[PDB]
Design a protein around this ligand. Sequence first.
Ligand SMILES: *[C@@H]1O[C@H](CO)[C@@H](O)[C@H](O)[C@H]1NC(C)=O
Ligand SMILES: *[C@@H]1O[C@H](CO)[C@@H](O)[C@H](O)[C@H]1NC(C)=O
Lengths: 175, 50
Amino acid sequence: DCQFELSGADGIVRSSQVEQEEKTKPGQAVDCIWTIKATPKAKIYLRFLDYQMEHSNECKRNFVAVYDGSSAIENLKAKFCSTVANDVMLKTGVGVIRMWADEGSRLSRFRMLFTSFVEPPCTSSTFFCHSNMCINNSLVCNGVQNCAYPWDENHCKEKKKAGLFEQITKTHGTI
Amino acid sequence: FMSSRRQSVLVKSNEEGIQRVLTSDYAFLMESTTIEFVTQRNCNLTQIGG
Ligand SMILES: *[C@@H]1O[C@H](CO)[C@@H](O)[C@H](O)[C@H]1NC(C)=O
Ligand SMILES: *[C@@H]1O[C@H](CO)[C@@H](O)[C@H](O)[C@H]1NC(C)=O
């Protein structure tokens, strides 16, 4: 009975949330539901930070499925039980990510990153990555990729540029 | 490399390839009679290798 109802902007989906929040106990089969209800008028881009299965290449004892819209066997976007999970892009603003795991395949873990986005012509409060992204301007300099190639994370480091003024310290600024 | 990343690196036209060379760090694989046209109008771009 996990039902980790997540919402809003960029959040984190962790497989260890069932272990941190005592929904199941170690020593039994787990079956969670991660609903990812979007910001109003949006679409969801799942991307996989960590993804490691205890019994790789075997769907009968562990997998991760990315049911979009509502949970039904028809709209099954991707069912990952191999080594690599590719970053899917849902159509609605609602997805029903689950994980099945046998008692033996309990150590199987993943960690995702869902991101809300709209159509190409962005406005204020929205940053534009290409290929259909209107991620929030908070997601620029978030420290995480909320797009493709890290475009939201650039020109976001400013310290100092100098010569001998850079070393007025325990370097040769003392001598 | 490309089959793992078909939603990211495989662009839809030659114009989306040239813009991602400009706006990003990208090494678009275009046929050699289009490179001779683009790398003379734009002066930011070049033909890598033979
Ligand atoms: C999205 O919008 C604002 C920018 O106007 C951003 O600073 C904020 O963190 C986000 N708010 C919500 C509710 O997601
Ligand atoms: C090429 O890069 C230079 C350097 O910033 C820029 O000034 C110029 O506008 C660019 N485009 C050209 C030459 O078409």
